[PDB]
Each structure stands twice: as structure tokens, then as C-alpha cells.
RNA sequence: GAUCAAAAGGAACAAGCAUCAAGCACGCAGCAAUGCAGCUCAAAACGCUUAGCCUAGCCACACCCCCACGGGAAACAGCAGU
């Protein structure tokens, strides 16, 4: 998603937020 | 029975032994138990990795067209059944989790590289 | 000003014949008619009959008619308050502001702030002018007349004034500062946009939106710093704020949209550099006492029209009162 | 058949406790400002709303401070500042507040909705009146306040069945079967409902 | 979440856009049984031999 | 409009005992005041006594007074326990 839209979700959830990667890897063996 | 707040939630319902469970789809009713009564008979499901590893599910779709078209409700694990099949589109609980463990595998391919 | 409504289209002249009726129906806990509370108001004839009414209006505040306390029931008590004292029990009614619910937003408001300078009455003209910001107002020519009173105490009072009285000054210049007449109402709004924007990095924007109707938006200095361009297309207080900010609870902001404690060098030349044009293109107390005189043709034409509109009210409601007690 | 004479009498005597001696709106929707519990009910609140009860302001703790309670005013939900930066708001036509409350509040009202700057007529009921996420739009900034400006494919097995039915029906018709989503609108989750769809507890 | 929220939405759209098809198909079968193109032959013929 | 489903209407639907053989308005007309005197039953009425049941299970009860305003009174016929 765009970050300014994503900034809204950061703006709501100050006290309880995780930090995650974006896309997955294309394969797993 | 006169059940207040009645709506068909379409469910697999347990009917197998202990330690080999076996759930059965019937067009279930909301407030009744797992092994209570239901609306109509459907075609069951196998959670058992058998000879040559298959775990069967049955679908008569001349009626699973009809019975949600009768205004039925559904909950989470059976959205896994028809999204995976090609009759319904896929639910956002594998879309996270096939990639969530791919984020765990990405956390694991570094884990297998930060040791070696 | 007094002798115009006081052709009152007469009624009876007792009060305790009514005072054993409204509370009796309150001990039935049934609602009370709208002409029956004005009739408890236009029979007030001593000092003690003022305070029985503020009980009874407070009791009438707790009634199944939260509305139907008509604005002319207020005015026919405004004339009683302006008659007797208008010193403490007129203002004590405005003090609670929810327990009496008067809200006198018409030219009746102009009946009650011209006569405070006629007794000069310093300490409390702050308070009523504070208690019209909380009303949505100033579609009448009290716009000049409101900021006319606050410039009297801008010279009188120079402190930190309170926790919240910084906001109590600027909002009583900014909604007065909607003037298409001059540079003066475009000068008063800048005092508002400054002082509302100085708690922005001191206490927070929740100060801006406690109780008096400001906005949840962040930008008010930049609103001044855009209309100061229009002052240069068509002020001794904002320089003091321009240094003090660069001088030494929930999150509202985005991390992308920048904190305005990091725009304080960008607040200096954005404000300073266009004042060079404002000497090259183009005190405060006395220039509004001109507006006391040059303006104010004394629009009582919406006052006496309302007085004849209140003969329309009482007659057609005592007519349906006549209907209810004949069918029995 | 044997009639049930007493259980019918308590069917209606209970039901004339259901209307008559109800606790009015400020006796049970009253709150604790310290422990964030409630008198007469006792329970507490989820983590996303503990401060909002304590910090911010109601829908009619505020509107009990205006002439005719703001008979033509505008109002927004607090997350409609945070979920739509487009203006999304409610207007007012009628107030039913309460008289039992010292510091009169907890009432009812209704009026005009307009979602995200999409206007609707025949005014319906305002929601969440008891909450503290409701914002008092001032008289300044109105005309710039209002600042506002098909099909998807079939799932894979239903592709193979309709097409191979068509050569049974006679004509090949490789013409891509495409169900219509234009018939079905796209309602979001903070879009308010009917308040009389809920009954009072 | 936010890409899943539209995937909740784009779950909710199409199967609802399928749901009106699921309703009308049996409503084309309560209509083919009642008023189908061979069903009109049924209504005339059951009186035709009978008279 | 389907789905599901009360109330309601109608037809069904246990056991033993005629040494339970008569029940005692149990009927109908008329928009309505009112009218007629009928209705059920030996092809089992009416009443006792016994029983959870016509098991993808259902019905009934939820300390007692069929119910529960009310009263008795302070109630595991939730699990584990006594
Ligand atoms: Mg009982
Ligand atoms: Mg017991």
C-alpha cells in the first residue's frame, strides 16, 4: 500500500504495533 | 424446534473416533451442538493422511450452488475449502499464511545462513 | 430601549398562584406548557422574585420540554434583569450556561452590553464577552462591538491570564475579524491566529479544541502568513511569538507530515520578510471607538419586528390553550 | 386445553416494567472516570477506547451548550477525521435530550448524513450518540469544509463448466464469461446504521 | 492488514456478485418448473387427454 | 421472493383398565340484540394407573406452588466432589 495511507494505521495504533517486511520471497524450498 | 436467531451456517461437524477425527458437512444450524440436527445431508471430509497421502473432501455443487443461494451463512475454515478448489475465490487467511510462513522461511533462510 | 416591549399585552399580577402549579405538575412529573413559564417571568416584582425564578427555570431546565423555553421568555426576563440590577444574578444565569440555557443571540444581546459601560463595572465584562464565543454568533453588527470590549482589557490586563485565557482572547478577535470594511478586521484576525498558535508547541492542539469552537486542523499561523500576503496584495504581537518558539499522551501526527517545531527557522523569514512590503505598501483601542460612531445605525428594525412577531406567538398559543380546556 | 393464567399476567406486568419504571439515559450510561467502569453495569472497555472515554467529548455533552441545541448544525465522527480526510459528516433536524441529567446529556438526535461528501436525503438516525468520538464543526470554515470532487472473471471451475455446456447447447461461445460487480455497491465498515435497528439496553 | 482488508472486500464483492446468481438460478428453477417452455405444455395437456 | 421458523388453523399420534359406561353445554345459527337444543361416546367418550419419546434425534423440566406478578424460601437435574 502507499505509505501516507499506511501512515494512518501507524497513527491509530501507537501503543501496539509490529514492524514487518513487505512482499514474500517468490519461492521456498 | 423454535430456535430464536436461526440461520444456516454451513459446517463440517465431527463424527469420528478419538485420535482419528472425521468431520461431516451438513447444512448446520447455529445454536445446536456439533453433533446436533441440521437441515440437509451433504458429502463428508477426510483429515487422514492415508495410503499415498490423500485427505478427501466431497462436493455436490449442484446443491452447494443452491444452499448458500438459500441464504446461508459460513465461517472461517470452510472458506478454505472452496477458495482452494476453484468454485469460490480464495480467502485472506491463506493469503496471509502461505506468505506468513514465507516470511518465517525468509526468517529461516537467514537462520540457516547465520549459523553456517 | 426599555419602554418599547413594556406595552406587554397585559395579564394577571400574582406569582404564587402559579408557584403552586408548576411544582405540583413536577410532583406529577408531567411537562409544563411554554406560555406558563413566561407567565412566571413577566410577573416579577421584587428582588426575591428573581431568585424563585432561577430555581424555577433550573427546574424548568429539568422538564420534558428541553426546548420550548422560547427566546422571548428569555427577553421578558432580560428586561426584568436589566430593570432591577443586571449585576450578579443576570451574570450568574450565564455562569452555568447549561442549567438555564438562555443563549440570547439577537439584538437582545445588544441590549445587555451597551449598559455595562453605563456602570463601567470592570471585573465581569470579561465574562459575558467570554460567553458569546461559545455561541455561534456575529451575523449581527456586534462583530465590531465584541472586539470593542476586548481591546478595553487588552490595555487593562497583560499577564499569562490563565491556562486557557490565551485562547479566550484570540477567538474574540478572529470571529470579530471577518471584516470587509477595513484593514482593522484584517488586523484583529492576526492577533487571533498568533495566540491560538502559541499553545501549538506548548500544550497541544487539544487546548485549541476543548470547548470554544475552533478546528482540529493544525494550521493557523500559516493562515495568518497567507493573509499577510493579501495585506501586501491590497502587527506588534507576532514578532514576539516568532522568537519564543525557537527559544527554549497520544500521537496525532503522521511521521511523514513534519512536526512544526522543526519549521521554526522556516517561520522566521516567512513572517519577517513581507513586513518590509507592509511599510512600503501600507492606536488599536481608539480606531474601534470610531466604529462605535461611524457604524451602528442601531438596527432595531429586527428588534421591533420580533416584538410584533411575539404577538404572533402568544396569541396563537393561548388560542390552542383555549381549545384544550373546553373539550373537557 | 388448560390455559396458562398466571404466566400471561407476568407477561404483561413485566412488560409494564419494560416501559414505565425504566432507568433513564443518564442513570445507566453513566461512567467512572478513574477505573473506567460503570455504575449499575460494572464492566470495562477494550484497549482502543480507554483514553477516548476520558479525554474527548460526546455527541450531546457538547450540543447542550448552544442556542436551540444547534438546530441546523454539522458534526463528524472522530475517526471520520482519521479514516476519510474527505469531509464525512452528519447534520441535525431534531433533538430529544434528557432532563434527568444534571449536566444535561445522553440524549437522542437525528439528521442529514453525507458520507465522504456523498449526500443523501430523507434524513435517517444518527449513530453512536453515547460515544465520545463526535466533533463539533464551528460556524467558520463551512464552504471550504465541503471539499469533495466494473467486472471480474469467474473462478476456474465455473469457467470450464459453462463453456463446455455451450457446445452441448450448440454454439462454442469462447466469449469470456464475466460476472457483473456494478450491480453490487461497496459499503465500508464505519458507514453508520439505523439506530432503531438496535433496541435500547 | 490493509491489503487483506481489500482482500476481505474483494472476497466480499465477487461472491456477493455470485450470490445474486445463486439466488436467481433456483429462482429460474422455481420458474422453469412453474412456467417453463415445456411446463406450459403440461398445463394444457393434462386437461387435453382428460376431456 | 426464496431459506428457516414460532404463534395460529386443520389432520394425525403410547401403554393397561369398561370392575372407568355415560360425560355434564360438553353445540349451532345469525353482521348483531338473540334463537334453537344440541354436541362427544360401546367403531371406547369420560376417567384412573404406568411410562420420557415414533433416536442423524426430539420432547419436557430447570428448588417448589402446572406458570411466577406474587409466595414458599435461599435450591449443582453445569464439571469435579460430598
Ligand atoms: Mg417452575
Ligand atoms: Mg440438587
mmCIF file of N, CA and C in Angstrom, chain B residues 44-111:
data_model
loop_
_atom_site.group_PDB
_atom_site.id
_atom_site.type_symbol
_atom_site.label_atom_id
_atom_site.label_comp_id
_atom_site.label_asym_id
_atom_site.label_seq_id
_atom_site.Cartn_x
_atom_site.Cartn_y
_atom_site.Cartn_z
ATOM 1 N N UNK B 44 -18.978 -35.795 2.866
ATOM 2 C CA UNK B 44 -18.092 -35.569 4.013
ATOM 3 C C UNK B 44 -16.641 -35.267 3.607
ATOM 4 N N UNK B 45 -15.754 -35.316 4.610
ATOM 5 C CA UNK B 45 -14.355 -34.873 4.540
ATOM 6 C C UNK B 45 -13.416 -35.763 5.338
ATOM 7 N N UNK B 46 -12.205 -35.971 4.802
ATOM 8 C CA UNK B 46 -11.223 -36.895 5.368
ATOM 9 C C UNK B 46 -9.974 -36.125 5.788
ATOM 10 N N UNK B 47 -9.723 -35.929 7.082
ATOM 11 C CA UNK B 47 -8.457 -35.323 7.540
ATOM 12 C C UNK B 47 -7.312 -36.303 7.762
ATOM 13 N N UNK B 48 -7.350 -37.484 7.145
ATOM 14 C CA UNK B 48 -6.426 -38.572 7.430
ATOM 15 C C UNK B 48 -5.407 -38.746 6.313
ATOM 16 N N UNK B 49 -4.118 -38.594 6.604
ATOM 17 C CA UNK B 49 -3.109 -38.916 5.588
ATOM 18 C C UNK B 49 -2.969 -40.420 5.422
ATOM 19 N N UNK B 50 -3.579 -40.938 4.370
ATOM 20 C CA UNK B 50 -3.804 -42.365 4.216
ATOM 21 C C UNK B 50 -2.659 -43.008 3.437
ATOM 22 N N UNK B 51 -2.922 -44.195 2.896
ATOM 23 C CA UNK B 51 -2.110 -44.730 1.814
ATOM 24 C C UNK B 51 -2.023 -43.724 0.675
ATOM 25 N N UNK B 52 -0.784 -43.507 0.222
ATOM 26 C CA UNK B 52 -0.367 -42.477 -0.744
ATOM 27 C C UNK B 52 -0.953 -41.092 -0.433
ATOM 28 N N UNK B 53 -1.026 -40.761 0.860
ATOM 29 C CA UNK B 53 -1.158 -39.401 1.369
ATOM 30 C C UNK B 53 -2.261 -38.462 0.899
ATOM 31 N N UNK B 54 -3.503 -38.924 0.719
ATOM 32 C CA UNK B 54 -4.589 -38.048 0.282
ATOM 33 C C UNK B 54 -5.622 -37.858 1.392
ATOM 34 N N UNK B 55 -6.252 -36.680 1.418
ATOM 35 C CA UNK B 55 -7.134 -36.249 2.503
ATOM 36 C C UNK B 55 -8.416 -35.668 1.907
ATOM 37 N N UNK B 56 -9.409 -36.527 1.697
ATOM 38 C CA UNK B 56 -10.501 -36.301 0.750
ATOM 39 C C UNK B 56 -11.584 -35.348 1.272
ATOM 40 N N UNK B 57 -12.196 -34.596 0.345
ATOM 41 C CA UNK B 57 -13.384 -33.773 0.589
ATOM 42 C C UNK B 57 -14.355 -34.029 -0.557
ATOM 43 N N UNK B 58 -15.645 -34.149 -0.255
ATOM 44 C CA UNK B 58 -16.659 -34.334 -1.288
ATOM 45 C C UNK B 58 -17.433 -33.046 -1.521
ATOM 46 N N UNK B 59 -17.826 -32.818 -2.776
ATOM 47 C CA UNK B 59 -18.699 -31.695 -3.105
ATOM 48 C C UNK B 59 -19.624 -32.036 -4.265
ATOM 49 N N UNK B 60 -20.898 -32.192 -3.934
ATOM 50 C CA UNK B 60 -22.012 -31.986 -4.852
ATOM 51 C C UNK B 60 -22.311 -30.490 -4.995
ATOM 52 N N UNK B 61 -21.871 -29.930 -6.114
ATOM 53 C CA UNK B 61 -22.032 -28.495 -6.284
ATOM 54 C C UNK B 61 -23.290 -28.123 -7.050
ATOM 55 N N UNK B 62 -24.117 -29.093 -7.458
ATOM 56 C CA UNK B 62 -25.443 -28.732 -7.948
ATOM 57 C C UNK B 62 -26.316 -28.189 -6.822
ATOM 58 N N UNK B 63 -26.011 -28.560 -5.579
ATOM 59 C CA UNK B 63 -26.650 -28.016 -4.393
ATOM 60 C C UNK B 63 -25.822 -27.021 -3.586
ATOM 61 N N UNK B 64 -24.481 -27.032 -3.645
ATOM 62 C CA UNK B 64 -23.780 -26.002 -2.868
ATOM 63 C C UNK B 64 -23.842 -24.671 -3.599
ATOM 64 N N UNK B 65 -24.175 -24.705 -4.883
ATOM 65 C CA UNK B 65 -24.786 -23.570 -5.537
ATOM 66 C C UNK B 65 -26.095 -23.169 -4.866
ATOM 67 N N UNK B 66 -26.980 -24.123 -4.607
ATOM 68 C CA UNK B 66 -28.337 -23.842 -4.166
ATOM 69 C C UNK B 66 -28.418 -23.396 -2.712
ATOM 70 N N UNK B 67 -27.557 -23.921 -1.850
ATOM 71 C CA UNK B 67 -27.865 -23.840 -0.431
ATOM 72 C C UNK B 67 -27.312 -22.571 0.214
ATOM 73 N N UNK B 68 -26.248 -21.977 -0.338
ATOM 74 C CA UNK B 68 -25.919 -20.603 0.056
ATOM 75 C C UNK B 68 -26.842 -19.628 -0.665
ATOM 76 N N UNK B 69 -27.274 -19.978 -1.876
ATOM 77 C CA UNK B 69 -28.360 -19.289 -2.549
ATOM 78 C C UNK B 69 -29.709 -19.409 -1.873
ATOM 79 N N UNK B 70 -29.827 -20.303 -0.894
ATOM 80 C CA UNK B 70 -30.907 -20.296 0.077
ATOM 81 C C UNK B 70 -30.636 -19.366 1.251
ATOM 82 N N UNK B 71 -29.595 -18.547 1.188
ATOM 83 C CA UNK B 71 -29.406 -17.549 2.217
ATOM 84 C C UNK B 71 -28.747 -18.097 3.460
ATOM 85 N N UNK B 72 -27.647 -18.810 3.274
ATOM 86 C CA UNK B 72 -26.925 -19.443 4.362
ATOM 87 C C UNK B 72 -25.773 -18.558 4.803
ATOM 88 N N UNK B 73 -25.210 -18.879 5.960
ATOM 89 C CA UNK B 73 -24.056 -18.182 6.498
ATOM 90 C C UNK B 73 -22.889 -19.171 6.472
ATOM 91 N N UNK B 74 -21.674 -18.691 6.711
ATOM 92 C CA UNK B 74 -20.477 -19.516 6.689
ATOM 93 C C UNK B 74 -19.469 -18.932 7.665
ATOM 94 N N UNK B 75 -18.575 -19.772 8.177
ATOM 95 C CA UNK B 75 -17.468 -19.275 8.981
ATOM 96 C C UNK B 75 -16.137 -19.756 8.419
ATOM 97 N N UNK B 76 -15.077 -19.559 9.204
ATOM 98 C CA UNK B 76 -13.727 -19.430 8.654
ATOM 99 C C UNK B 76 -13.116 -20.667 7.988
ATOM 100 N N UNK B 77 -13.122 -21.885 8.564
ATOM 101 C CA UNK B 77 -12.328 -22.946 7.927
ATOM 102 C C UNK B 77 -12.905 -23.474 6.627
ATOM 103 N N UNK B 78 -14.160 -23.170 6.276
ATOM 104 C CA UNK B 78 -14.728 -23.717 5.050
ATOM 105 C C UNK B 78 -14.567 -22.763 3.895
ATOM 106 N N UNK B 79 -14.182 -21.525 4.187
ATOM 107 C CA UNK B 79 -13.722 -20.605 3.161
ATOM 108 C C UNK B 79 -12.388 -21.084 2.607
ATOM 109 N N UNK B 80 -11.673 -21.873 3.407
ATOM 110 C CA UNK B 80 -10.502 -22.602 2.957
ATOM 111 C C UNK B 80 -10.854 -23.743 2.013
ATOM 112 N N UNK B 81 -12.108 -24.192 2.010
ATOM 113 C CA UNK B 81 -12.438 -25.387 1.243
ATOM 114 C C UNK B 81 -12.723 -25.054 -0.218
ATOM 115 N N UNK B 82 -13.420 -23.941 -0.478
ATOM 116 C CA UNK B 82 -13.887 -23.633 -1.829
ATOM 117 C C UNK B 82 -13.012 -22.609 -2.532
ATOM 118 N N UNK B 83 -12.342 -21.741 -1.775
ATOM 119 C CA UNK B 83 -11.316 -20.908 -2.360
ATOM 120 C C UNK B 83 -10.160 -21.716 -2.886
ATOM 121 N N UNK B 84 -9.826 -22.807 -2.202
ATOM 122 C CA UNK B 84 -8.738 -23.672 -2.640
ATOM 123 C C UNK B 84 -9.142 -24.489 -3.864
ATOM 124 N N UNK B 85 -10.451 -24.602 -4.121
ATOM 125 C CA UNK B 85 -10.976 -25.542 -5.107
ATOM 126 C C UNK B 85 -11.113 -24.956 -6.510
ATOM 127 N N UNK B 86 -11.460 -23.682 -6.636
ATOM 128 C CA UNK B 86 -11.765 -23.109 -7.927
ATOM 129 C C UNK B 86 -13.229 -22.839 -8.189
ATOM 130 N N UNK B 87 -14.106 -23.095 -7.211
ATOM 131 C CA UNK B 87 -15.517 -22.735 -7.331
ATOM 132 C C UNK B 87 -15.799 -21.403 -6.652
ATOM 133 N N UNK B 88 -15.097 -21.106 -5.568
ATOM 134 C CA UNK B 88 -15.066 -19.804 -4.927
ATOM 135 C C UNK B 88 -13.663 -19.217 -4.989
ATOM 136 N N UNK B 89 -13.539 -17.893 -4.915
ATOM 137 C CA UNK B 89 -12.206 -17.293 -4.780
ATOM 138 C C UNK B 89 -11.650 -17.462 -3.370
ATOM 139 N N UNK B 90 -10.349 -17.209 -3.241
ATOM 140 C CA UNK B 90 -9.591 -17.684 -2.092
ATOM 141 C C UNK B 90 -9.670 -16.670 -0.957
ATOM 142 N N UNK B 91 -9.629 -17.164 0.276
ATOM 143 C CA UNK B 91 -9.902 -16.316 1.429
ATOM 144 C C UNK B 91 -8.621 -15.647 1.914
ATOM 145 N N UNK B 92 -8.712 -14.456 2.520
ATOM 146 C CA UNK B 92 -7.498 -13.809 3.067
ATOM 147 C C UNK B 92 -6.867 -14.482 4.286
ATOM 148 N N UNK B 93 -7.165 -15.747 4.574
ATOM 149 C CA UNK B 93 -6.432 -16.416 5.633
ATOM 150 C C UNK B 93 -5.335 -17.353 5.128
ATOM 151 N N UNK B 94 -5.425 -17.892 3.901
ATOM 152 C CA UNK B 94 -4.200 -18.439 3.314
ATOM 153 C C UNK B 94 -3.316 -17.385 2.677
ATOM 154 N N UNK B 95 -3.891 -16.271 2.200
ATOM 155 C CA UNK B 95 -3.080 -15.261 1.527
ATOM 156 C C UNK B 95 -2.086 -14.662 2.507
ATOM 157 N N UNK B 96 -2.502 -14.468 3.758
ATOM 158 C CA UNK B 96 -1.519 -14.135 4.776
ATOM 159 C C UNK B 96 -0.604 -15.321 5.080
ATOM 160 N N UNK B 97 -1.154 -16.523 5.282
ATOM 161 C CA UNK B 97 -0.366 -17.539 5.967
ATOM 162 C C UNK B 97 0.551 -18.329 5.050
ATOM 163 N N UNK B 98 0.214 -18.468 3.762
ATOM 164 C CA UNK B 98 1.174 -19.023 2.811
ATOM 165 C C UNK B 98 2.372 -18.101 2.670
ATOM 166 N N UNK B 99 2.141 -16.794 2.791
ATOM 167 C CA UNK B 99 3.221 -15.821 2.802
ATOM 168 C C UNK B 99 3.752 -15.522 4.206
ATOM 169 N N UNK B 100 2.958 -15.743 5.270
ATOM 170 C CA UNK B 100 3.467 -15.583 6.637
ATOM 171 C C UNK B 100 4.585 -16.568 6.928
ATOM 172 N N UNK B 101 4.383 -17.839 6.583
ATOM 173 C CA UNK B 101 5.452 -18.810 6.747
ATOM 174 C C UNK B 101 6.553 -18.585 5.718
ATOM 175 N N UNK B 102 6.218 -17.987 4.569
ATOM 176 C CA UNK B 102 7.249 -17.495 3.659
ATOM 177 C C UNK B 102 8.005 -16.322 4.266
ATOM 178 N N UNK B 103 7.370 -15.571 5.172
ATOM 179 C CA UNK B 103 8.138 -14.638 5.992
ATOM 180 C C UNK B 103 8.839 -15.351 7.141
ATOM 181 N N UNK B 104 8.336 -16.518 7.561
ATOM 182 C CA UNK B 104 9.088 -17.342 8.504
ATOM 183 C C UNK B 104 10.213 -18.109 7.818
ATOM 184 N N UNK B 105 9.996 -18.602 6.590
ATOM 185 C CA UNK B 105 11.068 -19.182 5.779
ATOM 186 C C UNK B 105 12.143 -18.171 5.417
ATOM 187 N N UNK B 106 11.756 -16.940 5.067
ATOM 188 C CA UNK B 106 12.736 -15.877 4.899
ATOM 189 C C UNK B 106 13.469 -15.581 6.196
ATOM 190 N N UNK B 107 12.793 -15.704 7.336
ATOM 191 C CA UNK B 107 13.410 -15.682 8.655
ATOM 192 C C UNK B 107 14.207 -16.955 8.939
ATOM 193 N N UNK B 108 13.959 -18.022 8.172
ATOM 194 C CA UNK B 108 14.669 -19.291 8.295
ATOM 195 C C UNK B 108 15.822 -19.452 7.306
ATOM 196 N N UNK B 109 15.747 -18.861 6.104
ATOM 197 C CA UNK B 109 16.896 -18.928 5.196
ATOM 198 C C UNK B 109 18.012 -18.011 5.672
ATOM 199 N N UNK B 110 17.692 -16.963 6.440
ATOM 200 C CA UNK B 110 18.752 -16.269 7.161
ATOM 201 C C UNK B 110 19.199 -17.065 8.379
ATOM 202 N N UNK B 111 18.261 -17.760 9.033
ATOM 203 C CA UNK B 111 18.579 -18.597 10.185
ATOM 204 C C UNK B 111 19.494 -19.748 9.790
#
